[PDB]
Design a protein around this nucleic acid. Structure first.
Ligand SMILES: C[S@@+](CC[C@H](N)C(=O)[O-])C[C@H]1O[C@@H](n2cnc3c(N)ncnc32)[C@H](O)[C@@H]1O
Ligand SMILES: C[S@@+](CC[C@H](N)C(=O)[O-])C[C@H]1O[C@@H](n2cnc3c(N)ncnc32)[C@H](O)[C@@H]1O
Lengths: 99, 329, 88, 109, 75, 95, 329, 75, 99, 88, 109, 95
DNA sequence: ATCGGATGTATATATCTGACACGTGCCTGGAGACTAGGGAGTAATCCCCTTGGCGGTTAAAACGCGGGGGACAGCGCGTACGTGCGTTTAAGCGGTGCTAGAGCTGTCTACGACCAATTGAGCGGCCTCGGCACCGGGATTCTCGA
DNA sequence: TCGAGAATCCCGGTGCCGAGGCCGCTCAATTGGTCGTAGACAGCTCTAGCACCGCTTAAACGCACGTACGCGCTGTCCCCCGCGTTTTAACCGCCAAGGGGATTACTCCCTAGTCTCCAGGCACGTGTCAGATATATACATCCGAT
């Protein structure tokens, strides 16, 4: 006897909540460490002015949001609602990156 | 001003430790140092621990005065008791036993901890220069020492020896004639001259013998080194950040190596799929075979992912076979 | 003392599942299969490696040691990912 | 010597014709630069900036705000179908996305 | 003078020459029968490097001698 | 006591105070407008450079700028852009 | 050397035709020409065909001598019989009847076929210049003549009149005062001076009246034309290929037109969605309303798809309403 | 002198002036009450174009006169 | 009692026949007229050096062949074999031209 | 005489159904719905208009009257459709 | 005056170092051109052309032909996965496509 | 009696007679190789030009060409390309 | 699974044509020798900003449980697409003739680079106030189980 | 078809920090002349784009038949969503150090510009052989049938 929404309405609520805002959606310290340990593959050591890590995060977020916008069209094309990995793989190929 | 001395199982040599012990990282210091070298000797001979687990149990106090001098008193006169066990017609196990893998790893990490004081200074170099510092792990050197099979008539040179841990490990694990390391920079060389001393010291303290080596300071691109590179059997070079101008010159120096000479390298001096036509007959890849070693993880010091090390072998038969199949049509 | 360069490893697990799901919601996705969260980390690691490699090539040509924001803006512009707002 | 008069004022412009002339001249585009090239280019740049700023201001006003922030530049660009082609491959920082939901996802009635 | 040229692959080629022949001719002779350019051939015998300006008689190479052929890199 | 670093901020602000006389701009949006102007400058100027190499001329003139605008901008932006540039060059020569 | 003459229903005027008829395209010549103008008169008055389908049937021989002189003999003395039908107190239908659409189209195509000898010469111009030639269809001019409603106190000017068919059609279909066409190039103007003659000739031959017009050769960008453009009611300009430098000048000349003046144009002199702020107060689009005409197909002469023609109206009330709503806050 | 200014939209504004006022002031007066910039105003009365350098008395405009306001384009 | 192949084998034969060759697959005179009457929308008259029409045909063929190569992946994604217009429309959108 | 410029019209029907089906076979398509043949003509007409418009802009800048093959190669290169073999 | 010697011969090259120097110098790339820039650029251009021509010749040989035609350049490029990235957006005229059929289309057994 | 129009045909042919000594090239394939060389020339030279504007230098040197090659070519082509260029510049200065 | 007939694909042989590869003459661009000036290389100084460590508060991540909706397999029907055949349309090929317009050459005038003096436009530095964010409280809307 | 309850909006109240405006001071844009080369224009030549004709045959077209495939429906089930509790580590505020990025002053060597000269590479011709085309035959795949 609690109250409980039906599966799929809180999702449509989060859609609007996150398409209305402009904030970044990944934590900042985890992403900074990821950048900093990708750049270890160059034997020398580097220092990453802070606006650089911010620029990297902006471009990284904006790449994934549009990849998901294409994955969704692929999934709806197959008469589905759930997105699966075989939709990412088709978006990235038709788009011109995987082949 | 007192001690934390201990006594030599083979020979009569003292170890010295000041009461304020050195400072290391998160949880690491001379406490595990000493307790573990005791553990390694107790694994070395069984009568020692058969005398050294009587009377005692497992853990001990790291910060306390009397627990460490407990361990020192116990160990020192227990080893005197071992000396009396060997006072008779008995003779201990050989002196020239090449140390096992675990024992050797303890030795090298012990030497590195003691000599190198301020490791962050090793990062004082010029960006993207040939002088950048980077270190190879113990496991990759072991893999290489077992992949190449050095006889007693091979010479081993290590270009850019860094601090020297590669040459020390190879000199203690192989039966060759002589071993050389050349290092141009100042800061790593000043530590190399200490590593040499401390390695000889701890090695004869444990009672294990090694080959003979020399950690010199120089420049492998000199006029004096061209014919030492040509008169060498196996070469180890970490040319990850040497760039194309120094690698071109090292290629010009490797052409004069003798048959069956082998190199190992971070980056290959020749493509892994080197074809051969009338156009690349000047390339050094036309007289050598390149094989990529297995990429075990933790191979280098600067990143966590694994890197491969590209064994090359000098074999001029491929060039003559190409020339001889050229006259077939 | 202990070795130089405290090494970092497996930091891709910091791109956590709720973060991937927020990005999916902003992209307009209603229901997410449970195998998406690893395909996505693969895609992200490839993108980031390709951009940071060029940013470091630019920062090494200039004979310096910090990656500035102009290095990232040039590395992005060279792949068709123009970015406005960081000093272009 | 007569009274100075910027080249922008003779053209009727707000953008700097002399600075555009210098940037063309020092930019390795050609051996020589004409006289009307900076005037033409500055007039075009000013037209385009006015075209964007007008729509950005409209979007800021109907959010009940008096300042333009990057979200209003983003909305202005993506809602206009010819600025969206000029800027089809740029990423405006802190700009968000357009509100858009597919009609098969909305709940049925 | 009959000579044998031993290669590093265990191949031996037999050649017929006279001591009065020039070095240019000998290198051409090796090229002629096996196709190896003369500039890549380095000939060593009894620890001596053959010099362009000497003659075969200069090195006291007598009948039924064996020469060693080492192959070099170009430049 | 820094060096002088120039930008289009004051001209962007002068144009804004004509289209919307009672609106302001945030600093981060002035950065975006600044990179926008440079981006379109380099597109047009590089296209005109190329167009003058093709014809074996060595001058960038007001014809190259007009043709580069007609090549780059989309359909209905380009009409108004060339009609702005023409009016400017006319007001200039008749002076 | 004989004739193929025919006789005037109104007035007494001869038409002349040489026996070797002109050469036209795939299947087109003076045969359909004459048979159809006969058909149009028989539709014009019913007594003629009530006399001209007796005695005969439908088709006739185009290449034959005696079939055309059959038609001429029959038509000429049948019209003499009509003249005798009207010899009494009877009076024919009015002379000032503006010709119907089909009759007028026949007239204009007749004039064009006769005067313009070598139409491919009209293509002698400079590429991408303002002097390119292109022609408007009959149906689009009709649509425009019905969209604008010219009273008897309007003046119509046609800038770049080409050969003149636009001014001829408007002068024959509208009741205005005077009509002008100005044309700069040489080749179209030399044909315009023939079109004028031939139109007056054929029009009074049929017996239909028109307004009065003038097809001059000049330059609408001259000093003499600025105040004639400012003193005009409706303007037709085909500025498809004039480019931005001539259109800027025409905009500078249209500012001085009187209220309610209308223009029609291939391309609009003002955007269809022209907003208005403190920055474009010099633009001419701030004092005019632009409406796109319906795109009927076959509208122009150079392509097959339809083109629209953008009626503009001068109305300065929009500027004052903007200024007056400016003082509201 | 009281005057009326008739616009093309059937709007009339009433103004109070004296013949001694300058043309700059009159144009400013129209701007002041309706917001139209003086450079766009063209005033025509009894077929005369008003000239910057004349005075109101110069044109013999008397009390209860009506002026016509035509709007022009800028440049 | 004639002999007749089953539906889908002559198609797989034409696939190989046309993926083995390099000729152009559109008639030349019809395509030339199409080019020539697209270029009528510019009031002036143009002349089309013949290698120009050949270059246009090469690029036009190569555009459509790759568009069909993407349409096929979209159709197979929906568990189909037949290609339909809603697959062209998805390829052209994900690819970045329709939106 | 009769008017200048013999006009051409509806030439897209010359891209016939067998031609579209050969292009589909080279693209690797086994079965073609029957509504594809009009969607394809639409796609082709848009592509060709966009390329020929730039080819004519280039040919008018040079103040000439024939479209050369370099005009087409430049118009294609400007859209990312680089073409090798016609004189680039 | 000594004996002339082309700059290609000092470098060991087959591509024209003097012509590359001229094309860089007359091409509006920079105010000045170094001395090793044409040598480096000509060596790189020659390496890449040899890399393509080798694979094109292989493809021509296993079609049982002794001349290279555009089909062999196409096959060589598309079958190598790093030349296919350099030339990922070019169209080789008269080059065809790679033979490739989807495995769901092949007849079932 | 035409003007002189130059190309890379003879150098392409000299390189081919080294890799495959008994192969020829058709004329249409020599056109393709000719446009390939020009295309890669302009890519590398334009990237080096840009790289020298960024750093406020006014010389295109052998460092700009090396860095532009490392930016443009894919992973394993770029290694061999820089090792070819380095060898050439070395053989040149030591002469 | 195996077998037989008919169709389509590959393989070997002759002949022939036109495009490639090679040789010749000439001319224009690349190499050689040299001088002058400015760009980049190097050493030294300064100070901003990147890195590293600490503690606390709380927001977000991780984990687990319950159930419902959506993915996916199976089955049936019916239309629309493939295959093959006979008829009809125009592409392709060749050959001819014309004349326009692209390409080149020779003069000459206007326009843009360069330079020296000078002064105002635009930048950095510095305040001040108002737009916007954060917060509490009431109203309204929307979802879900009746 | 409608109540309960959770989520979202809307209306005031307080504060702060960033936008906007003002000042002083360099340094870049403007003015006024001079010079020399790019490009504009007139005239000439000759190649190649356009238009026409006829003929042969390949490809497009229209049609009939049947079958495989697209699409709708139904049933199972399991996996993803919504929610509540616990655990982790992000964020924020603060402090301290020292490195490396940015600037300035000198000096030298590498590159542009010039003049002479000569050979490499282009256009033009010309011969021969690689590849296409046609025919004859082997055989490999498909489909109906057992
Ligand atoms: C990458 S470190 C390798 C360290 C060591 N080999 C190891 O694996 O532990 C390479 C060293 O080579 C040295 N080095 C670089 N160039 C050198 C040269 N030209 N001559 C001698 N040593 C050089 C540098 O000092 C650098 O420390
Ligand atoms: C596009 S034609 C229109 C023909 C005619 N209006 C019709 O619709 O039938 C435009 C004509 O305007 C003429 N023209 C162009 N510029 C002109 C000018 N500046 N002054 C006078 N006539 C001009 C040209 O000769 C050209 O023939």
């Amino acid at each position: 006897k609690p109250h409980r929404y039906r599966p799929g309405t809180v999702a449509l609520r989060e859609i609007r909540r996150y398409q209305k805002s402009t904030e970044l959606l990944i934590r900042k310290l985890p992403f900074q460490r990821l950048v900093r340990e990708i750049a270890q593959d160059f034997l020398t050591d580097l220092r990453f002015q802070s606006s650089a890590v911010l620029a990297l995060q902006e471009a990284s977020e904006a790449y994934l949001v549009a990849l998901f916008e294409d994955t969704n069209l692929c999934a709806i094309h197959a008469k589905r609602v759930t997105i699966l990995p075989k939709d990412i793989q088709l978006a990235r190929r038709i788009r011109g990156e995987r082949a | 001003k007192l001690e934390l001395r201990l006594k030599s199982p083979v020979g009569a040599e003292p170890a010295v430790y000041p009461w304020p012990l050195p400072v290391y990282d998160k949880h690491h210091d001379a406490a595990h140092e000493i307790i573990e070298t005791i553990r390694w000797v107790c694994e070395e001979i069984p009568d020692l621990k058969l005398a050294m687990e009587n009377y005692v149990l497992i853990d001990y106090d790291t910060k306390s005065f009397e627990s460490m001098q407990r361990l020192c008193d116990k160990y020192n006169r227990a080893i005197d008791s071992i000396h009396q066990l060997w006072k008779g017609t008995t003779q201990p196990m050989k002196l020239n036993t090449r140390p096992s893998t675990g024992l050797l790893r303890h030795i090298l990490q012990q030497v590195y901890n003691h000599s190198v004081t301020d490791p962050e200074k090793l990062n004082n170099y010029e960006p993207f220069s040939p002088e950048v510092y980077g270190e190879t792990s113990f496991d990759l050197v072991a893999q290489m020492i077992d992949e190449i099979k050095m006889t007693d008539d091979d010479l081993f040179v290590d270009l850019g020896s860094g601090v020297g841990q590669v040459v020390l490990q190879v000199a203690a694990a192989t039966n060759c004639k002589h071993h050389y390391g050349v290092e141009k920079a100042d800061i790593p060389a000043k530590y190399a001259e200490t590593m040499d001393r401390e390695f000889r010291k701890w090695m004869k303290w444990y009672g294990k013998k090694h080959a003979e080596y020399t950690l010199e300071r120089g420049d492998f691109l000199s006029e004096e080194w061209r014919e030492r590179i040509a008169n060498t059997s196996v070469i180890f070079v970490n040319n990850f950040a040497f760039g194309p101008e120094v690698d071109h010159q090292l290629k010009e120096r490797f052409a004069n190596m003798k048959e069956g000479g082998r190199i190992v390298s971070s980056k290959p001096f020749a493509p892994l799929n080197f074809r051969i036509n009338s156009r690349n007959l000047s390339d050094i890849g036309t007289i050598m075979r390149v094989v990529e070693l297995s990429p075990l993880k933790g191979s280098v010091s600067w990143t966590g992912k694994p890197v491969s090390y590209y064994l090359h072998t000098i074999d001029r038969t491929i060039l003559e076979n190409y020339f001889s199949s050229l006259k077939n049509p | 003392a202990k070795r130089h360069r405290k090494v970092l490893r497996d930091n891709i697990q910091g791109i956590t599942k709720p973060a991937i799901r927020r990005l999916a919601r902003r992209g307009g996705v209603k229901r997410i299969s449970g195998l998406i969260y690893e395909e996505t980390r693969g895609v992200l690691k490839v993108f980031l490696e390709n951009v940071i490699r060029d940013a470091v090539t630019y920062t090494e040509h200039a004979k310096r040691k910090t990656v500035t924001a102009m290095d990232v803006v040039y590395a992005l512009k060279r792949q068709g990912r123009t970015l406005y707002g960081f000093g272009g | 010597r007569a009274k100075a008069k910027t080249r922008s004022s003779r053209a009727g412009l707000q953008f700097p014709v002399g600075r555009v002339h210098r940037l063309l001249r020092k930019g390795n585009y050609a051996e020589r630069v004409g006289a009307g090239a900076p005037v033409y280019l500055a007039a075009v740049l000013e037209y385009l900036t006015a075209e964007i700023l007008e729509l950005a201001g409209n979007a800021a006003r109907d959010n009940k705000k008096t300042r333009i922030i990057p979200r209003h530049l983003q909305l202005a660009v993506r809602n206009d179908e010819e600025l969206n082609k000029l800027l089809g491959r740029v990423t405006i920082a802190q700009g968000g996305v357009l509100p858009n939901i597919q009609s098969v996802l909305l709940p049925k009635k | 003078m009959q000579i044998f040229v031993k290669t590093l692959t265990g191949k031996t080629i037999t050649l017929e020459v006279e001591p009065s022949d020039t070095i240019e001719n000998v290198k051409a002779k090796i090229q002629d029968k096996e196709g190896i350019p003369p500039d890549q051939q380095r000939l060593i015998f009894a620890g001596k490097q053959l010099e362009d300006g000497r003659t075969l008689s200069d090195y006291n190479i007598q009948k039924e001698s064996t020469l060693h052929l080492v192959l070099r890199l170009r430049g | 006591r820094k060096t002088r670093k120039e930008s289009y901020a004051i001209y962007v602000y002068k144009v804004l105070k004509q289209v919307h006389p009672d609106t302001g701009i945030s600093s981060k949006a002035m950065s975006i407008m600044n990179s926008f102007v440079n981006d379109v400058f380099e597109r047009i100027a590089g296209e005109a450079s190329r167009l003058a190499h093709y014809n074996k001329r060595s001058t960038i003139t007001s014809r190259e700028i007009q043709t580069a605008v007609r090549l780059l901008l989309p359909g209905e932006l380009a009409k108004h852009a060339v009609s702005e540039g023409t009016k400017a060059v006319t007001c200039y020569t008749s002076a």
